[PDB]
Amino acid sequence: AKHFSGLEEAVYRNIQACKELAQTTRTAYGPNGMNKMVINHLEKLFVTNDAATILRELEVQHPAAKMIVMASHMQEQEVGDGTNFVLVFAGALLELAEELLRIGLSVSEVIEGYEIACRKAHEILPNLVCCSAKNLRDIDEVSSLLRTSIMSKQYGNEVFLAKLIAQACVSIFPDSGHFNVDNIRVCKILGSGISSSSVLHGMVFKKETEGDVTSVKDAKIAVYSCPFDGMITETKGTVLIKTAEELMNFSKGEENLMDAQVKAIADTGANVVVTGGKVADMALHYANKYNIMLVRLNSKWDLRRLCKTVGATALPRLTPPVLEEMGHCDSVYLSEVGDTQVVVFKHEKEDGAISTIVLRGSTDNLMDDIERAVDDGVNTFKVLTRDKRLVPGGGATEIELAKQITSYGETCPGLEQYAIKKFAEAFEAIPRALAENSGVKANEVISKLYAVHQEGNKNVGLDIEAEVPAVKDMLEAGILDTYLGKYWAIKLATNAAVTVLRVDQIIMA
Amino acid sequence: NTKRESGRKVQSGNINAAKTIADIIRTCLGPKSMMKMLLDPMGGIVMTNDGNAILREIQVQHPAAKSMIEISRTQDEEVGDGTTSVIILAGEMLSVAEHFLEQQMHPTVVISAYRKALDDMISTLKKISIPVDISDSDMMLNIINSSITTKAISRWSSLACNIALDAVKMVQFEENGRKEIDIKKYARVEKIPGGIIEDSCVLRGVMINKDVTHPRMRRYIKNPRIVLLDSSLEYKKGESQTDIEITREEDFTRILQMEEEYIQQLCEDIIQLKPDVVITEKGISDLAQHYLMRANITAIRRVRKTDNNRIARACGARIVSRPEELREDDVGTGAGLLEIKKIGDEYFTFITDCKDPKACTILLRGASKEILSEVERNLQDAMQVCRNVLLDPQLVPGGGASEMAVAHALTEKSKAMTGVEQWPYRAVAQALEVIPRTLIQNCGASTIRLLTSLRAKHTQENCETWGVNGETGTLVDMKELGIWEPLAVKLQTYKTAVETAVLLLRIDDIVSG
């Protein structure tokens, strides 16, 4: 990648990673973010305060950033927040050592100072763990629990989403205690309000849904990418355009063709025949006359969505579905989902593992913002299934370690002494990532947070109370992190930065 | 078209190439040995003690650099070695005299000087050429390992010289040309892949690797009998011309089948007649030689008259139309051995053929397939010594004072032969002393004053036989140094070199196209 050299990657590319990584947290992380416009090769305005998205929405021009970008993603994997953390925190890690270089402190030397401290962190981490809360059937406990993660990644409604997002994951598995990486596949539907966004379950086809409901109770489907446009391998679908008479004649044969089609599926049984392909006129009205449910123009996503929940496979060929190829759902029915009429399947006692939260608004950005938020809620649910542990929100938690980490550095010495106390500095950037996102200074806060001096309820969040920096109790605020997420957060950021600290510049043939 | 060129401009470009040609190898030549690297346009290193390599591999500088690789291959053919010598000697001899003498301005008095130094070479050579006995493979072995150690190899010097000793004697022309001048066609060199020097068998004759390609063929039969065509192969090579159909897949095949079936019946006419070998100089076909190999008849196929001719006398095989048709015989034994010796499953049939014209393709064995080449080269220039010492037991002690051995005798004759020619003679008197002094300059110390002391030692004590050591730079006996220089090599490299110099002296104009 880089023919470039001259002690560049260390003194230079590493901070540029932090550059790319900063402000994508520091004004994007907190009780809220502050919007970051993005236009992909798919050209549209994408507002992302979520670390993972905007990172992947940008394309890495570094070997440097290339490494730790995943450390922020794997957090969204592992946690669902503290991804902006890895942006700021791991971004706040090495730029310290940028001094150590000009301080005349080596790489392999000062890594150790950073190395041992994550343990000391991971050793301090269980301390400031503040109580804990778990009921996987609580929407309420989980609502405030999903708050901290959506907050950082959502400028949209924190509480009502927390009411919606802690609904579905609790609602789709009512039991829970077993939770799927994807237990909720939101059905994104534009229109009405972001409040019109609601919580449904099972599968939803927002795609064109036709025929008619002959069973709202029974949901049986053979999921197909096969066109009923006249694509079937039973007979040979053959469209003849060579003469207008030929066109008219096959359409007549198309009635009996579709009679070989949606019949053959409901021959195995079916209600919705899930059609990822196309349906022509004589076929449509036949299946309308055959009175099978045709959801039409199904894209691969709703397939990939529905393909998992029923256990059936979308077929580009039309055949009568085998047991494997015919899906069943709890119930298939037409309900306005967030008050827009589309078909909504039911999988809950089906084993569920798909909730459909209709994500709404009058613009995609409304439907996209919560889309950034809801998964953090989906994420922290499993983070809840893993540990019940509550550790308060960001910016209160860091100061307690740092003070110890600093006194730890005091007990550290040997030339990594301050290299540990550097790690002690990587802490305060998180409340600063809130304070900067708020618009006041952490030095004040740091002054205050070591003035008020206690550590783990004392933090300023994104506020209009942040005119003057004003501390709130994170555990108490309804902003509730966990041990793991922080323990995950520290880990990768401590992991990815010290190893990109170990890099050299690239020789090229 | 219409063109004219001038003199020193064309004369200096000679040296301009000739010098650079002469340069790095004189550090590569002799015990002091260096790598002449080429940077490929491709960017790769090519590291040689040989100039022709880097020369050939790169842009050809027209007047001089085109000339020498030729006289190199002229020299490389002569004794087998000394391309490096010729190319450096000429450019050397082409340098100091010329401009000096060409500011004195004359082609010709320079030309006569080339011969006199080349003559002052000859005599004091053959004067100080030390006869070393061929009756002793030893007194060959002492000098034969000496010229296999020329630059980088003391290793294969042991084995390859062993192979070369009696081979050169065994090497014969087919005129009974002797065999002291013997070529590397009659010495023939084919390295045989794999095996090891412990596996090495001494083949003083030829290997016919065509002879046994499969165990079906005659093997370990003392001497073959090669039946050439003419009856045992009756004559039909043709085919019956069956119809062809592009429709059927089989009709394309059956026409080609009918072509091989007649030699199949010619090789069948061979089976009953029962040769041990059939040489088919027109050759045989694929399915036919199966029939050949039925009767234990090895087929030497599509082979020239002479390969058979030499091998026939070499392998001791008659030349007949048919075992029941008698012109009688060529030779029943030229070969005291038939060895079929295999590395891999391809049988390399090594037949040691006593004093036969043959190929004398001499079995040589490296530790692997690859280093066989150097062994061959170590075997080639080992034969060089033998053929040299078989030619002239006289050769000169070496380590480089041989190059002085002429140089100072020139200085005396410059004062003796005199004329105005002394000045070319004196200007060519200088050329021969840079090369050993370079070996001694590769040694450094004072390579200059030592050579003057050598130049003393030349006339003081000894011209060459007591010389200077090339990797040392002390007064040494080039006989006691054990580095022996073939007399003929001196007759060759110098001679060949002076001529390209006379050549590039002769041509002061080069028109292109």
Binding site: A1, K2, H3, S5, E9, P63, K66, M67, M70, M74, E78, S106, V107, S108, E109, M231, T233, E234, K236, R317, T319, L415, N495, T499, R502, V503, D504, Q505, I506, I507, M508, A509 | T20, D23, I24, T27, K32, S33, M34, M35, K36, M37, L38, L39, P41, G43, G44, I45, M47, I54, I58, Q59, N442, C443, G444
Partner: protein, 513 residues
């Protein structure tokens, strides 16, 4: 074309030699770092292995040729010393260049190198002791071996699994591991981890509930040319061409499936009884869900996707024979695996064929979520094993961590070569080239290299205490003490490639372009 001459022909050689060599000093020892080379793949390679980054991407140099030559064999011979083989010659050269910079012969300065390496090889032979094949004894080496190769925490975390691999050897004769390397890779939640498994493991398995988890009596049917065919050792053809052909093709597959599963199940019926003994077919392609189910209810353990190389170690582990069909077979060809197990960690189904009749193999499941991790943490395994195996492969080992380094340098007594300074100078750059091993380690930490190094000598200048740079702290240690020890193959061989390539420099006095 372009000829580079003399010191110009020398410069870029030693210039591209030492400088690029100097580029690499972030590494070599646990105080060394990783070095990032992004290949043309855009791959992030952070490596402390010298052998690696040479060939991958290296700034174009003619010198980039010979460096790729020597350190290859260094990883080939030992597996370590490769990160070492870099830093010797430049030191040697930077020191040697002076004499040439002082106008002395690369020729003569060559000859002190060659002369000096002996007494160090002697010293290596002298300063070594037998360091036994005991794992713990090899740990200290494996600890340290991977250190010169890679990072300590990575050098450490493998050292557990490392010597265990060479512990299971059969009295295998190799300096390196072949079959003890079974590389399984999983995307993990731990970047650096490796699951060490004895014997072969199969890349993927096939799990079924009726399919036996751990099969202690396992008659191994290796399988190929799968259920899609009907009692055929040859893979037949398919028609997917037309959407209609795809439909009529895949229905007969059941019968093709039916044959083999039948042939399978009744093969269990012969040898195993009905379900009475465990049984394993290993279907090295997919297993069709019928036979996936039908072999499972049979009692057979049907394994999906074993590699052809998994096939290779497969029948040796169970001591049986491979079959390319699913079909009734002589019971001997069914291999008996004292254990066939299948382990699913995440997505991958790891078949454990254990109690391998030949424990020629063990299995290393490489972990990382990230490529560069999965890339690199694999890398340390591969060189170190080869290195560390030398600790068991050679009962002799020799101290690492600088302990021996200052000793030969002290013992060299450069004036003892009195002959010229051919030797006496070339030995001087030698003791210099020796100590680059403590240098970079004393370098990479605080102080200086010398500042600690000059201790190391003055420390071991008190003789008999073999002292070196403490690997990480760049400060003195005795490497014999902890057992931090570089392979008898590491240290003995290393000087050889070092002396020759820097000599190759000195033998190139010209590079043409």
């Amino acid at each position: 074309a372009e000829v580079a001459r003399a010191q110009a022909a020398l410069a870029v050689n030693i210039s591209a030699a030492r400088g690029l060599q100097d580029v690499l000093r972030t590494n070599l020892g646990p105080k060394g770092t990783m070095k990032m080379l992004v290949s043309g793949a855009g791959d992030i390679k952070l490596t402390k292995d010298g052998n690696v980054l040479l060939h991958e991407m290296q700034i174009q140099h003619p010198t980039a040729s010979l460096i790729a030559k020597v350190a290859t064999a260094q990883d080939d011979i030992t597996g370590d010393g490769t990160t070492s083989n870099v830093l010797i010659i430049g030191e040697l050269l930077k020191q040697a260049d002076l004499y040439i910079s002082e106008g002395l012969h690369p020729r003569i300065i060559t000859e002190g190198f060659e002369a000096a390496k002996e007494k160090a090889l002697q010293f290596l032979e002298e300063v070594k002791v037998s360091r036994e094949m005991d794992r713990e004894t090899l740990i200290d080496v494996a600890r340290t071996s991977l250190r010169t190769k890679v990072h300590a925490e990575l050098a450490d975390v493998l050292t557990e699994a490392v010597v265990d691999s060479i512990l299971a050897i059969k009295k295998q004769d190799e300096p390196i591991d072949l079959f003890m390397i079974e590389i399984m890779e999983m995307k993990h939640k731990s970047e650096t981890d490796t699951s060490l498994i004895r014997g072969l493991v199969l890349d993927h398995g096939a799990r079924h509930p009726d399919m036996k988890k751990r099969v202690e009596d396992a008659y191994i049917l290796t399988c190929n040319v799968s259920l899609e065919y009907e009692k055929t050792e040859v893979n037949s053809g398919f028609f997917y061409k037309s959407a209609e052909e795809r439909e009529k093709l895949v229905k007969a597959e059941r019968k093709f499936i039916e044959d083999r599963v039948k042939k399978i199940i009744e093969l269990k019926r012969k040898v195993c009884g009905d379900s009475d003994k465990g049984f394993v077919v290993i279907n090295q392609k997919g297993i069709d869900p019928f036979s996936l189910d039908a072999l499972s209810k049979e009692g057979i353990v049907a394994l999906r996707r074993a590699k052809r190389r998994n096939m290779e170690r497969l029948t040796l582990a169970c001591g049986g024979v491979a079959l390319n069909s699913f079909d009734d077979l002589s019971p001997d060809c069914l291999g008996h695996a004292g254990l066939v197990y299948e382990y699913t960690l995440g997505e991958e189904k790891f078949t454990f064929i254990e109690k391998c009749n030949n424990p020629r193999s063990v299995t290393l499941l490489i972990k990382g979520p990230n490529k560069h991790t999965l890339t690199q943490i694999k890398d340390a395994v591969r060189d170190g094993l080869r290195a560390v195996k030398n600790a068991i492969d050679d009962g002799c080992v020799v101290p690492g961590a600088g302990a021996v380094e200052v000793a030969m340098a002290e013992a060299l007594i450069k004036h003892k070569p009195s002959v010229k300074g051919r030797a006496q100078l070339g030995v001087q750059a030698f003791a210099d080239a020796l100590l680059i091993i403590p240098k970079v380690l004393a370098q990479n930490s605080g102080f200086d290299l010398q500042e600690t190094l000059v201790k190391i000598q003055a420390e071991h200048s008190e003789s008999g205490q073999l002292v070196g740079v403490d690997l990480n702290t760049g400060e003195p240690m005795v490497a014999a003490e902890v057992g931090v020890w570089d392979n008898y193959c590491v240290k003995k061989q290393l000087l050889h490639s070092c002396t020759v390539i820097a000599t190759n420099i000195l033998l190139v006095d010209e590079i043409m372009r």
